[model samples]
Target: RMKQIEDKLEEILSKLYHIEXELXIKXLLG
Candidate 1:
């Protein structure tokens, strides 16, 4: 049960970072 919570947090953070990174790349390229 404890590990499940950490997994969820990691997944969410990964997506958050991915979106932030994509935006930065888009701005730099455009």
Candidate 2:
């Protein structure tokens, strides 16, 4: 269960990081 939760958190973190990068690019463009 702990391993599964860690994997899920990592997946979510990756998504969050992707979104952060996307926002940074958009801000630079704007």
Candidate 3:
């Protein structure tokens, strides 16, 4: 159960980081 929770958190963090990267790129381009 603990490992499952950790995996979910990691997935969310990964998505958040990806979104941040997208925003930064848009800022640079726009």
State every prediction's TM-score relative to the real structure: 0.65, 0.66, 0.69
Better of 1 and 2 by lDDT: 2
Instruction: Check candidate 1 and list the clashing pairs.
Output: none
Question: How well is each residue in 1-30 modelled by candidate 3, as lDDT tens digits?
Answer: 999999999999999999988787676677
Candidate 1's residue-wise lDDT over 1-30, tens digit each?
999999999999999999987787676667
TM-score of 3: 0.69
Per-model clash counts, in order, read 0, 0, 0
Q: How well does model 3 score by local distance difference test?
A: 0.91
Candidates 1 and 3 compared: the better one by TM-score is 3
Model 1, position 17: C-alpha lDDT score:
94
RMSD of each: 2.6, 2.2, 2.4
Q: All models: lDDT?
A: 0.91, 0.91, 0.91
**Tens digits of per-residue lDDT for model 2, 1-30:** 999999999999999999988787776677
lDDT of 2 at 21: 80
